Structure 1
Amino acid sequence: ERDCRVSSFRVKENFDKARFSGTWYAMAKKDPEGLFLQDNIVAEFSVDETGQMSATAKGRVRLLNNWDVCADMVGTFTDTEDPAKFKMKYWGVASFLQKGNDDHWIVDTDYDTYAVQYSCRLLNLDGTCADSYSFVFSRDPNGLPPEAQKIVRQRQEELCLARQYRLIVHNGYC
């Protein structure tokens, strides 16, 4: 009875790019098909004077046949009419790293503690997502406080993803 249509999902009201800038540690991830970032995932958000948001990310990614590499990624965000919904062009500093262009939604944040991100790469014909991913970010790499954890869990359920996350470990691999 829950609505899982992507078009129904609420996102962060009056999203403030400047307040969102700085270091975000991925605490949990819902993987898309053909997952890329594995763990040790840390993102750095910036906004420039024209108000355009960009980011970098580092994380371990496992090329198949189990080659471990620390990916260094770059992302640039094109605004839409919703201040919390973006198009993210991304690529690796190395040519061979994955590149592409994903929807990037800030579903919720309080700027100084937690953030919930969401991307639907491909819709189902009923408006639900066929291929999604989602990061939960923390300002503190040791994790969220209980109050924020509980808010995030609610947001995870609203995205119809709450059963599908895994924890992201940080152990200095990069």
Structure 2
Amino acid sequence: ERDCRVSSFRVKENFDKARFAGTWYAMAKKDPEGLFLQDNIVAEFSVDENGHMSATAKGRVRLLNNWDVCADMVGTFTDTEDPAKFKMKYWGVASFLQKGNDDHWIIDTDYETFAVQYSCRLLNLDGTCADSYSFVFARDPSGFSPEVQKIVRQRQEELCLARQYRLIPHNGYCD
């Protein structure tokens, strides 16, 4: 039934970088393998004059040594032939934080209430994702509307990630 091949996933039509800019609170996430931001996650997206999108993001993360630090992360997005699909090069302002290059797809957003992001880091041989992560972001760090939760749930099902997300606390700790 369900097509779970990554190449089949619908993304936001006519994605608008400039409209996406601003503050996005992470309200729920699906984690990938390995280290990952844990909670108190807020991203700030920017687009410069020449249309280049970037973002900073802050969140608590536990390092291999169980320290729970506030990470200040930086990403720069490279446009692709699909306006909703980017390559995100990222790093932290501390040198010990993870650095990498991930797909960054805007699965859906209405720009002023919610967004659903996705990254597949590794494809299975069948074209499904072997190692994904996904954030549900909000403009307002309260809960969402029933009507916006239902839409978010539909987008999670499109990604074959239904029931795989956890809610994210916001309770001080970071910057």
Q: Which residue of 2 aligns with 1:147?
A: 147
CA-CA distance at 1:71 after TM superposition: 0.3
SS in 2 for 1:28: strand
CA-CA distance at 1:35 after TM superposition: 3.2
Unaligned runs of 5+ in 1: none
Higher mean alpha-carbon deviation, 17-26 vs 140-149, is at 140-149
Whether 2:6 is the aligned partner of 1:10: answer: no
Distance 1:172 1:18 in 2: 29
CA-CA distance at 1:144 after TM superposition: 1.5
Distance 1:42 1:129 in 2: 26
Q: Which residue of 1 aligns with 2:38?
A: 38
Distance 1:5 1:19 in 2: 29
CA-CA distance at 1:2 after TM superposition: 0.3
CA contact (8 A) 2:78 2:86 kept: yes
Cα RMSD, aligned residues only: 0.7
TM-score with structure 1 length normalisation?
Answer: 0.98
TM-score with structure 2 length normalisation?
Answer: 0.98
Higher mean alpha-carbon deviation, 131-140 vs 142-151, is at 142-151
CA-CA distance at 1:147 after TM superposition: 1.3
CA contact (8 A) 2:28 2:135 kept: yes
Higher mean alpha-carbon deviation, 71-80 vs 135-144, is at 135-144
CA-CA distance at 1:60 after TM superposition: 0.2
SS in 1 for 2:148: helix
Q: Deviations over 1:6-49 (max 9, x none)?
A: 00000000000011000000000000000310000000000001
Q: Runs ≥4 in structure 1, deviation > 4 angstroms?
A: none
Unaligned runs of 5+ in 2: none
